[PDB]
Amino acid sequence: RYDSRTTIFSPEGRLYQVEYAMEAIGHAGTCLGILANDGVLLAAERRNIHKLLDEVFFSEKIYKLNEDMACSVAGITSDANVLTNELRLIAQRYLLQYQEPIPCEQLVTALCDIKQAYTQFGGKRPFGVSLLYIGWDKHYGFQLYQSDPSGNYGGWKATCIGNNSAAAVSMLKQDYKEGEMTLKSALALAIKVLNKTMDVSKLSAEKVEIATLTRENGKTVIRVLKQKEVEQLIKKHEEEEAKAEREK
Amino acid sequence: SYDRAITVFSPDGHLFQVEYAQEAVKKGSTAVGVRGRDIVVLGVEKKSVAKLQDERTVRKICALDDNVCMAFAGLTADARIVINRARVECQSHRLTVEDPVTVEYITRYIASLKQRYTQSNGRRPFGISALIVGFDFDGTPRLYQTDPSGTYHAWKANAIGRGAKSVREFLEKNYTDEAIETDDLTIKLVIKALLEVVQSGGKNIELAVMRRDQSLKILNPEEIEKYVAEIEKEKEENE
Amino acid sequence: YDRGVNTFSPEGRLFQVEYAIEAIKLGSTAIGIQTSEGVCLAVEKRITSPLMEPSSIEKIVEIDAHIGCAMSGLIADAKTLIDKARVETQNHWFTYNETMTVESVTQAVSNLALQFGEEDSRPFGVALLFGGVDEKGPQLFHMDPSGTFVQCDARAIGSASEGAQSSLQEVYHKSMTLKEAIKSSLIILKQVMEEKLNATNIELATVQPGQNFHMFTKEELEEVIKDI
Amino acid sequence: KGVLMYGPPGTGKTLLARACAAQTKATFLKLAGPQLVQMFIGDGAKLVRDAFALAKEKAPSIIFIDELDAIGTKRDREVQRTMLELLNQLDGFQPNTQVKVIAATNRVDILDPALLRSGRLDRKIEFPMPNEEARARIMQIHSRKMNVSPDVNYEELARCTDDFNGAQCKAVCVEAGMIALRRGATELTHEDYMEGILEVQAKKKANLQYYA
Amino acid sequence: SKLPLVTPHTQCRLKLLKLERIKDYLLMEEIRNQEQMEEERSKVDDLRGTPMSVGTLEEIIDDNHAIVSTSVGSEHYVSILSFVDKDLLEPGCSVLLNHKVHAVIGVLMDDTDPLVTVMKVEKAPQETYADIGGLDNQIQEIKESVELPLTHPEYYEEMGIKPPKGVILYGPPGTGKTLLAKAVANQTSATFLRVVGSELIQKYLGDGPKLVRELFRVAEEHAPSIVFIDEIDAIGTKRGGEREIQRTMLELLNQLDGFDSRGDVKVIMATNRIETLDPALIRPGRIDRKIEFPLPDEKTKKRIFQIHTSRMTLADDVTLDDLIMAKDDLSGADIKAICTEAGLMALRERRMKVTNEDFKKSKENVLYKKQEGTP
Amino acid sequence: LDKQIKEIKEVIELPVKHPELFEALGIAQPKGVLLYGPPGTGKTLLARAVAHHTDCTFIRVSGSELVQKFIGEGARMVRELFVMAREHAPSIIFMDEIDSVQRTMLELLNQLDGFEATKNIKVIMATNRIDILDSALLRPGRIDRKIEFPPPNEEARLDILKIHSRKMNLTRGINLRKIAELMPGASG
Amino acid sequence: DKPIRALDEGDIALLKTYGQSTYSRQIKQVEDDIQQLLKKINELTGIKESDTGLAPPALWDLAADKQTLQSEQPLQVARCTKIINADSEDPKYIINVKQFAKFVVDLSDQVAPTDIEEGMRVGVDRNKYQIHIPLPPIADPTVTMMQVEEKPDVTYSDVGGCKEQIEKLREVVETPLLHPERFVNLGIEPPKGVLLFGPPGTGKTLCARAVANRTDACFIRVIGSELVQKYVGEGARMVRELFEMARTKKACLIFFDEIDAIGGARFDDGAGGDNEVQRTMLELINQLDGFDPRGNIKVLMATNRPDTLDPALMRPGRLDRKIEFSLPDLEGRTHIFKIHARSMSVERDIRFELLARLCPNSTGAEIRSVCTEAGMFAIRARRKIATEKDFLEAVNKVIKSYAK
Ligand SMILES: Nc1ncnc2c1ncn2[C@@H]1O[C@H](COP(=O)(O)OP(=O)(O)OP(=O)(O)O)[C@@H](O)[C@H]1O
Ligand SMILES: Nc1ncnc2c1ncn2[C@@H]1O[C@H](COP(=O)(O)OP(=O)(O)O)[C@@H](O)[C@H]1O
Ligand SMILES: Nc1ncnc2c1ncn2[C@@H]1O[C@H](COP(=O)(O)OP(=O)(O)O)[C@@H](O)[C@H]1O
Ligand SMILES: Nc1ncnc2c1ncn2[C@@H]1O[C@H](COP(=O)(O)OP(=O)(O)O)[C@@H](O)[C@H]1O
Ligand SMILES: [Mg+2]
């Protein structure tokens, strides 16, 4: 039994606690970052579809902290909340000492260093939260990144985290698009990937939360989709699959 | 006594926990660096960035100062925090002390950092090792490596476990006491070590060469492929 | 009865630091001799790889020119003790404007050695040999993770230290000249460690009352090579 | 009706039991703890009950238990059941008739709960390590057959033989005899006894300042 | 008994010739002809008048008297007749008795002890040196300590050595450690006893060490024999389980040497974790030899497919050298899957003949079976 | 569920019906099978069914006896099942709920590596949950595929109803289709 | 890729044949016909006679076999009990035919009543169960092979460097039995218990075998693991007949090897554990020194952990003398090298002292292994003489390979 504490090493040289954390996000959600151009989006599904849950904040998976930053969340809710507030504080400090927007990579690496520090020291537990962010800055513009409890940040053209991640990444390899891959094509791909990852047919709009950032508004804007536009996207996917059935 | 604690000795005096740190490094990928006639050359391998993942975020190599760069193998989080610590240490020492920094001081500092974070309970040791290159041994090149046990040493050429078992034996068989003739033969020997490395396809292999008088230089994939083809041809007429 | 240093064993011993004594066994052997002509220290290398810089192993290190030092143990705690020794000697000079006598170095180093379980850690698995030529003439001391220190006419510490120590006891006496003591240490090392001795696999250091500088030996081992 | 003999080994409990058997002329039953365990389900209980029955049928009888802790282990249920049969035989409806029981152990702490009850074992007799004068008498007793030289101060040997048990002192006399044989001595003297103690006393241990 | 093996497995008329030659010999053997064209039996079989009973004997009082017990459990002091093999009768054996006076009338084929009946493994004929790829250093070393002492003690007899009593095989799993020792049994004539260290760890207090005695007893009556202790590390490493394992270990060291004699049986042990077992196993006085099994290199691997690809039908596009280059990534046992998965893979292609692409689609699936960590 | 039947047949029924194919193409016969899915949901129902169609001896082992947990007989009991199966060849060995100690796991791996396929004797070991141990068992010479048991679909659940619907009577219009759709994600 | 399914029965027929049509049908027919014809041969040959056989014909039968068959009594075994002796003329005897019954019987007129004691394991006739013959008491089977019954081929000459150890050991174990007259005339009782202790491989078992060879009296070997039995109390019972069997001999030696296996000190803080072993160890302690003096049964005891043994067993009287075994010095190493190399085929020109002083604290087993490895080095070159070079290379191999 060499899995008790985060600060010990096992005779095969692995960290069972951090692996347990990865498996903890293994059933967290199905949040994804879409491969897109002219605009970048996040797609999230909520396992809280219910007749009485209120969703008062109009969003429980997405959280926006900038005029050019936003994040999608899948993991332990308390850890997720403290991490998002910590990101807000880091952005505030960087804007105060630089009077300049933070680079996305510097911010995410700072968070990953904090997470690694939280894992390294004794009596402390890894944040079992993996969350996806997007941002536009003066270093690399359109940017999409992923972070994990161990303190590692993953840069991806497209990625998905949470449950059934294998199917999502496999199809994103298969249904991959490059370059000209507009935001609307990203909406179609996100719709398809969530329909396959979920067991549902005719994916209901209230079971998905999607936000995006657009740069034709080059002063920069971030939008969170409402129910009607998502339902229209669902109808478009349904007519696409109906046409595919007509292709026989 | 057993290995369940950081500060506990084994009944024969061994510290199994730091040995487990070294082994956790040993599972980490290939990392081999050499110092040539004047230049120091390194080669990053086994990145295997799969399609959707971007190679920019991999950070195959990070430069601490203009005369020292590092990448580490093992856990990327520990590698990153040690990179930040070394960068801050070297920059602050050069800025504050009456005289500037040399690679020996930062070597001592990182060795001390590993020894310190290894020294007490409630504080996990780093699971990373790295091969240090310095330019200002009175202008001469020099090469170290670092280990989770807080241990460092100087080498003419060094490798770590996954790359060690094959590549390092290949070097100790091949390494000429004559320093590799010019940076050309330095890169040739690095490419030969990469040939001793697992795959050598060039899909993820990248190299950074530092001349010990010039600052660090980064090699493009096309030049790496050209060098690999040149080495393959050289093996071809070697018959 | 092994959880920590701060627990007494049933016999009154400590089964936590007795293993720190066992850690000396896994370290390389080193030889130290005190002679009226001078103090000499010998260190075994067992070359690990030709690519290594041979001097990169700090098992032979100087804390001041009037004194010598040698190591047997984990090189990390070794370097910690080495740094602590240099710091105490330099501060002693800074305050008193004189050389720190070797006995005071050995005593003052040991206070850091006495921190495993009495402040508010773990004993350093390193055993050291000191050699100094000062106001009490030529001196050689030995100190171990338990914190005890002893003035030694000769001493061998590390792996295979027992046989070397026994043979040295059979040959050595406290009235030799320095050269024959070095020769005895060299033949004992040649017997024990690997093979025919050379600069690659053995290190030598010696300081003299008339030469309170440069214990180190750099390719003057060639005389030893042609002699022994 | 119950006498328990306890103390460190070498104090001579077995010897006292042997002498008590020697002088009593009564029916004497000797047995060790492992003789009663057995593997069969009831076998040990049958042995205990049947031994008590035999002690009854012989009328004035003494039972000697040696190393009672074998079945006297605290409250594997087989040994427990045999031990319970033992205490019920010891107490007994129409108790004990005329059967006296003697028990010898080196470790009382294993006996504990109810075997040490005042009813079953009325008298607990402690056997201490032999006193200095006691050790002198001890060496006198076993040297009686060995033809020692008269110029030997057994009080001096007692002074040397601290912490010695009776068995160790007997071994000291035997070692003096063997040392005399090694010398091929016609008679043995005080020096031989000193060498005997020096070889008996202890391991003498290692260098006790270099420890940790 | 068994037939010889045809030399080429490939479909050819040479194999037809060999099989028809064995057919011809078997036809000459085909009993019909001989089936077409007294005092010793009459007297003694009268003495052992039918029916006969089987009894267990554990005594020899005189050279003609002993105590014999029957199945119901009753014990009888009975006389031994002349025709009973005196050396064959030993305590614990099963003896035939006369039904009238229970007189001992002969020894019987011993058929009992099912556990050791499993323990005397087959001759291992399926394994052979011809099935092993390029373990040259291991072969000569294992030949030094195991095969040669059991084949020509003459060198040891003349020169005066006592041959080594034990060898331990260490290496990563699948390197062929077990296969080599099994091949030694086939190569020699000695009977093969195989045991995996995990099995001898037993629930009851004393059976674990008893099995160790039970094994080395079994080796002794077979005289030339091999005891194979697979994955020894379960009973040998470092330190109520604690005490019994130590007790079990010490039993090995007492049967691996210790007191009395050891006869002729050789002991071979295997494990993956030589750096973990008790120094008593590493003790270079207790165990004379420790054999290294590295991961197969380029040349060794090429032999492995040559050994394993010999049986399927191949294409000309197969490039075995390409599948070799990467590293010593996989052991031979993995390469068996490489062949097996490919054979299935080419089968899924609806082709009875394998191509290079099948091996590439064989190599990848083997690789995904590996774990993940330290990203 | 239909995909389960084909791959189990290809890995159990097929090695039973046509051994000539594997000798003709020179392969070692497939040796083990491992099932992923929710507990039951046709897990045992499949293994019991295939043995009937091959008429080989079926061995049923619960996960409970596998985990005796006081070093009961795990060391040798595995062999005793195996040897008896060889005595009654051809036979099928089935164990369920492997997730329900390490020493007998190594024992099973060695036997799985060691026993001969010369008797059409195969091991089908089944699991309910996704465990870290399970991914470690997928090794050469031990198991060859990853059959999955998904939760039954709408029409699929309807067929399950129809399986037991033969015995039950009905009204003048029982539409099982409408009943079927009321339990999304329900197991078998 | 494109999804596909398994094979079709229609496909398989041609697919198994298709390309392979050259010799496949013929080869398969030959193979199956070979198999069935072999089964034929095995059947027509008949069942291979599982007849065990008898002694070779020249020795056996004779009319004497039928004579003893028709004349001798099929005696039955039983256990005597509690001689009645009510009238002392025909004292009557109660016996227990074990598994069969219990009876009150008399003696045959051939056997005297003085020839029968209580229990006595007496055999009786089959008809009226008269006492017809006394029988030796049944020693437990597993206890029986524990008797060595053969002398190992080692003398005290083989043991080297332990000269004072073997001297005291011969003083304590061999001297009293060979020369009892020295002790009694002086008037001393010699010691009866010896404990041999030291590092592993020091040579304790070697001295044991040497004693067993030079004993000339009855010698019984014991390994501490043997007495451990899964039944409760079986080990103690085993120790009981082990000691009683020894008492039957005219003085006898008993040798326990690594008594550590059961000799552990008694402990209770586990509320269970190895107490079953502890009961056997208590029985052993009682047997060595207690009531019913042991008699002329000298006990030889060797173990790697003298510290761990229970003090009660460790007490003198049971273990009278403690003998300490240490790693050989240079003189001891030279002596043992002389011992082992003497039997080996070498040139009589080797510097054994050089080898020994080259040898570190390496045990005696290391010396034996190094000599054997030098022989192996010679064998690998097929040199029918060993060389000093072989001895050196063996020293490097063994000593440095472990010392790595
Ligand atoms: N007071 C004593 N007087 C004479 N002899 C003694 C005495 N005490 C011990 N001995 C000696 O002790 C030897 C055996 O020890 P004994 O068994 O009697 O002691 P113990 O402490 O009861 O031991 P254990 O409980 O192990 O049997 C005898 O041979 C006897 O000579
Ligand atoms: N060098 C080799 N030559 C031939 N076969 C090999 C070799 N290495 C591995 N194998 C294959 O691996 C199996 C032997 O595995 P092995 O390593 O003995 O198991 P373990 O690791 O349990 O000892 C054999 O079936 C054989 O086909
Ligand atoms: N797909 C299915 N169709 C019909 N019945 C099923 C199905 N899956 C499970 N069952 C029911 O499950 C029972 C068989 O046990 P099963 O669930 O297959 O495995 P386990 O015995 O492990 O639970 C049967 O009684 C059967 O009615
Ligand atoms: N003092 C010695 N003299 C001669 N041979 C020795 C000596 N010590 C060890 N040996 C050799 O080493 C072996 C030691 O075995 P031993 O130590 O008796 O086993 P155990 O572990 O049972 O005590 C012997 O076979 C012997 O050949
Ligand atoms: Mg007593």
Side-chain angles (χ1 to χ4, degrees), chain D residues 8-15 106 138 142 166-167 170, chain G residues 289 315 318:
Chain D
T11 44
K13 308 177 300 304
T14 308
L15 188 68
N106 300 300
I138 279 273
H142 295 306
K170 171 205 168 51
Chain G
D289 173 26
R315 147 161 103 71
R318 300 187 181 95

Side-chain angles (χ1 to χ4, degrees), chain G residues 103-173:
Chain G
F103 288 108
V104 181
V105 309
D106 36 31
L107 329 180
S108 91
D109 39 40
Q110 313 97 59
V111 289
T114 58
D115 202 17
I116 303 299
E117 197 221 1
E118 184 151 29
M120 261 285 318
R121 197 202 186 189
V122 47
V124 298
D125 83 80
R126 214 186 69 172
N127 287 16
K128 319 302 271 273
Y129 304 139
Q130 285 217 318
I131 301 302
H132 279 217
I133 177 171
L135 300 177
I138 169 164
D140 194 298
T142 169
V143 181
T144 309
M145 323 76 92
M146 221 65 88
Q147 193 158 220
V148 68
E149 310 176 338
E150 63 89 11
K151 281 162 40 170
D153 83 79
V154 172
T155 76
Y156 296 134
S157 322
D158 308 88
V159 180
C162 307
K163 206 171 307 301
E164 73 286 27
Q165 280 95 348
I166 42 149
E167 169 44 40
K168 296 206 300 189
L169 192 93
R170 293 178 80 167
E171 233 186 71
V172 76
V173 152

Side-chain angles (χ1 to χ4, degrees), chain E residues 23 31 68 130 142 169 214 220 229 236 240 251 288 318 374:
Chain E
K23 185 94 65 179
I31 318 85
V68 168
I142 214 163
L169 277 41
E214 171 205 40
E220 253 282 88
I229 297 305
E251 187 65 295
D288 289 305
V318 58
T374 71

Side-chain angles (χ1 to χ4, degrees), chain A residues 2-9 11-16:
Chain A
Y2 288 118
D3 86 84
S4 61
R5 208 165 62 217
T6 41
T7 72
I8 206 57
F9 262 16
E12 82 304 336
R14 294 215 190 293
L15 282 293
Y16 296 108

Side-chain angles (χ1 to χ4, degrees), chain B residues 1 4 6-15 115 118-120 145 149-155 157-158 171-172 175, chain C residues 2-3 15-16 18-20 22-23 26 48-53 56-58 74-78 80 121-125:
Chain B
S1 66
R4 294 175 290 282
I6 294 163
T7 49
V8 58
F9 273 93
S10 173
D12 46 1
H14 302 48
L15 293 298
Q115 183 151 192
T118 312
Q119 182 57 1
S120 321
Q145 77 312 331
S149 56
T151 36
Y152 100 89
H153 274 289
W155 296 67
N158 180 253
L171 327 184
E172 314 155 89
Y175 172 93
Chain C
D2 276 23
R3 192 64 66 159
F15 322 151
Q16 185 59 238
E18 283 195 317
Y19 318 161
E22 292 286 75
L26 71 83
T48 47
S49 174
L51 313 167
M52 206 99 57
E53 196 284 301
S56 186
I57 291 183
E58 321 176 40
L74 314 185
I75 86 173
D77 322 314
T80 311
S121 64
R122 142 193 37 77
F124 333 114

Side-chain angles (χ1 to χ4, degrees), chain F residues 1 38-46 48 60 94 96-97 128 152 156 159-161 163-164 187-188:
Chain F
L1 71 173
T41 324
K43 205 170 301 296
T44 54
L45 176 58
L46 171 59
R48 161 147 70 198
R60 160 60 169 279
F94 168 64
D96 201 0
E97 289 95 23
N128 318 342
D159 308 330
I160 310 171
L161 291 172
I163 293 180
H164 324 277
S187 179

